[PDB]
Structure formats: structure tokens, C-alpha cells
Amino acid sequence: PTHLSVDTKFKTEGLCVDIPGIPKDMTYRRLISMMGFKMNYQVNGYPNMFITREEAIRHVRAWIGFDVEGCHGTNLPLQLGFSTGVNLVAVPTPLMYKGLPWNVVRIKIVQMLSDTLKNLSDRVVFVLWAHGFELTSMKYFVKIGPERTCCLCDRRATCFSTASDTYACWHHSIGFDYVYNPFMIDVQQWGFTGNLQSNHDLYCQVHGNAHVASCDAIMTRCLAVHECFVKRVDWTIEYPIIGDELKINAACRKVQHMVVKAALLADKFPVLHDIGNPKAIKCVPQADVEWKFYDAQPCSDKAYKIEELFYSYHSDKFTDGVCLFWNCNVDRYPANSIVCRFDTRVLSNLNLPGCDGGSLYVNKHAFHTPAFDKSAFVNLKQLPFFYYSDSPCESHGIDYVPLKSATCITRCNLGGAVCRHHANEYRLYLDAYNMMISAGFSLWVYKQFDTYNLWNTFT
Ligand SMILES: CCNC(=O)Nc1cc(C)on1
Ligand SMILES: CCNC(=O)Nc1cc(C)on1
Ligand SMILES: [Zn+2]
Ligand SMILES: [Zn+2]
Ligand SMILES: [Zn+2]
């Protein structure tokens, strides 16, 4: 059962204030038909406009919360709100646009979805808390049919133009007027008691109710993110590569080895406490240090409390040596720590808005991360950039400008002139470092960390 059967029942109780008299007995087949669409017994990749919770999770990058509020409904204006923060007024004659006819509103909808989604997904999934008007407004901006490809590329078609009678993906849709073969999911079908605001406000204080359609669209998508990624965590779902995923992950491994290796050399801790990932391997396998592991899955709701991770009777002394928290989000890091913490506020194609300040970081897997909080790092300082290498000065095997840098911690820089090998490795490491920081990761270290202590490791 790959797709959602059209003959599945759809609960219509949430629809009856906007649509009084709505039949209690309803299927997706009958609902799509009443929304003014015709599926025509077509076996061409679009079996249902509506999708399962499982299909929505795999297409989280395509999620766009959508709500429609009656301003005054064929005779009255409609306020269309999207989780992008946009509000458009459609007339049948927190950005707020004045009343305009459907023929111009639909051009704006195609532009907005195309700009938001071209670098995220091959589709759109309208996330709803369906009350009626949003479903009956879809016939004014949506066209359906067989699965098609773009007129200018191989990507699947997401838009249609009535002017040219052609189809386009999100990348080539300038001037297009119809959303083609969108997907949608009604959060109210999952079984909730009470309205949208009461269910959303149970888990989130960051999204308020300013009483506009875009606030509801935002609350709806936030509630769906909470249900599918915060309280239910699935690390077996893989997601496509849409950017610098591989470079970011390779950089993260390079930076971790570099920072931990230099902390061990500079301060000679007798024991390292590695807290986090139950499948972690020693990042510095040749280090002398006693390596002790403590399992903690990535927290997706609230940050771990250091009192619960550490106190309940382990070397016992976490105060001895150093603590390594590589993406293990805690409320307050101990002073003897090496930390990598993802900054949820970062703007990127990998980082989607999350629940209660948190963010949904999608890189191979989906990781809902609790809100970045500066007070967690009060016992530490920001880790400054440095490159450290004790490998021999030898080239082996891209042109050159002599490198001059106070942060290239090598025997050759100590001796006055950086060798070509360490200059090539430094620049590669600096590129990897900048990639990781720009992806949203932040590095923190114990206050006594000083790179001046690495120079005497060459004697
Ligand atoms: C689902 C779309 N339905 C409508 O637009 N109208 C109505 C009216 C009644 C009654 O049931 N559906
Ligand atoms: C428990 C350590 N975290 C992970 O294993 N992975 C993560 C967490 C974030 C954020 O990004 N990757
Ligand atoms: Zn295209
Ligand atoms: Zn929220
Ligand atoms: Zn060198």
C-alpha cells in the first residue's frame, strides 16, 4: 500500500462549520470530486491528491502549511495564508496583500512556491488543518492530471501555464499560473481533541496567534513537524542530496579529529568522556588517553539535563579529564568540555523551521534539534580557528603562493617557513572548517585551551 487509497474514509467533522450539511460518510474519491477535480480513472503516477503520514515524512522538505480564512466564499473575499508568512487576499470579482482577483493571485502563488521550493524538493505538500474553505479554494489555483516532466529539463512538472499550454518544474516556472499535481495532508485526520491552537500551544510557545491565515498555516506545519519528528523519531528514513551534505559531513569528521587531538596534546587529559552517539568510534584512535563512552541518542525535543546524564552513581568522575559533546545537546555544559552544537537559527537549504524554537536539520536523516541557547555555553568559550599538524614536511605528488599564518601550527611554521604540504593541508582544512561553520555548527571549548601549548609538541 505505497500510496493512500482514494477509497479510504475521510472524517468530515472539521469541515462542517464552513460546509454545513457535509456527509459524514466520505472517501478521498468523493472529497476530490466535490473539490471540483476529476481523476478520470487515470493510472499515471498521481493516484491521490492526499498522501499518507509516511509519504509526507519522506517529503518533509516539500511541506507548506496552508490555511484559508473567510474575510467576509464565491460571494466573499478569502485570505490565503502560507507557512512562508505570506497572506494573499483573493476576491471573486506577516505580509498582508490587498484584495485581488484569482487570475493574479494564482501567478503570485506559483512564484512564491517556486522560490521557496526549487532548492528543497521536487514537489509541494500542502499541510492543512482542514475546515472547508482551503479545500474549496484549490480549484482556483491547482490543475491535476498525469505525471509530467518539465518543458526545459528532466525534473518532474510542478507548474502549468495556460498562456503557453506547457509544464514546468520549480526552477523553470517564471510566468506560470497554475500549481500542477500538488500533494496535501490533513493533520485533523490523525485524531486530535480540540482546535489547532490548543494542540499547537501544548508543544510550542514561539508561534503566536495573530488571527491571520498565515499564523494558522505556520501552527499547522509546526504541529505536524512535532508529531512526525519530535515525539516520533525515525532514523531509518533517508533523504536525497540537495546541496553540500557530503562535504559538510566530511568536514565535521575532520574538525572533530583536529580539535580533540589538539586538546589531548595541549592539556594531556588522562581520560576522555565521550557523550552521545551510541555508534561512535574514537575520533583520535592513536591518542594515549583512556576513552570512555556514554550512550545518548540525539535529543529531538528539549536539551538533555546534565544532572540526568551525569548524576545517578562511568569513571564516576566526569570532573576528571575532559568531556566531549559532539552534537549531544545539553542544557549547560560542564567547564571541562569540547563541544559541537548545531545553531538552529542558521539559514540553509538543509535547515527547515522546527517546533518551539528548534529546527529540522535534514542531511541524510532528519534531525529535529532543540533551540540554540547561548546560556548553555557559560562555562566555556568559542573555539578559535587553528590548524595543527605533526606529520612530516614532505610534498608527494594545484599551484602555489607561500602561506603566512599565525594559526598554521606546524614544525615548518615554528621553523620560520610553512612547507608546501602543510600549506596545501592548511587551506583544505580551512575550507572544510568554513563549510562546517556556515552549515550552522558552532564550536566551544574549556577556557584553559590555548594553541600556544601545541608548539612544544615539536621538540
Ligand atoms: C468538499 C467540497 N464541498 C463543497 O464545496 N460543498 C458541499 C456542500 C455540502 C452539503 O457538501 N459539500
Ligand atoms: C548524538 C549525536 N548526534 C548525532 O549523532 N547526529 C547529529 C545531530 C545533529 C544536529 O546533526 N547530526
Ligand atoms: Zn525544469
Ligand atoms: Zn509552533
Ligand atoms: Zn611542514
Swiss-Prot record:
Region ranges (GpppA-binding): 355-369
The reaction(s) this protein catalyses: a 5'-end (5'-triphosphoguanosine)-ribonucleoside in mRNA + S-adenosyl-L-methionine = a 5'-end (N(7)-methyl 5'-triphosphoguanosine)-ribonucleoside in mRNA + S-adenosyl-L-homocysteine
Residue numbers binding Mg(2+) 1: D67, E134
Residues engaged in binding Zn(2+) 16: C393, C412, C419, H422
Origin superkingdom: Viruses
Chain ranges of the N7-MTase domain: 239-459
Domain ExoN: 49-230
Binding annotation for Mg(2+) 2: E69, H211, D216
Regulation: Inhibited by Remdesivir antiviral drug (GS-5734).
Annotated S-adenosyl-L-methionine binding sites: D274, I275, G276, N277, P278, K279, A280
Binding positions for Zn(2+) 14 per the UniProt entry: C150, C153, C169, H172
Cellular localization per UniProt: Host cytoplasm; Host endoplasmic reticulum
Binding, Zn(2+) 15: H200, C204, H207, C222
Assembly notes: Interacts (via N-terminus) with DDX1. Interacts with nsp10.
Function description: Plays a role in viral RNA synthesis through two distinct activities. The N7-guanine methyltransferase activity plays a role in the formation of the cap structure GpppA-RNA. The proofreading exoribonuclease reduces the sensitivity of the virus to RNA mutagens during replication. This activity acts on both ssRNA and dsRNA in a 3'-5' direction.
Designated name of the protein: Guanine-N7 methyltransferase nsp14
Gene label: rep
Residues of the full protein shown: 5949 to 6449 of 7096
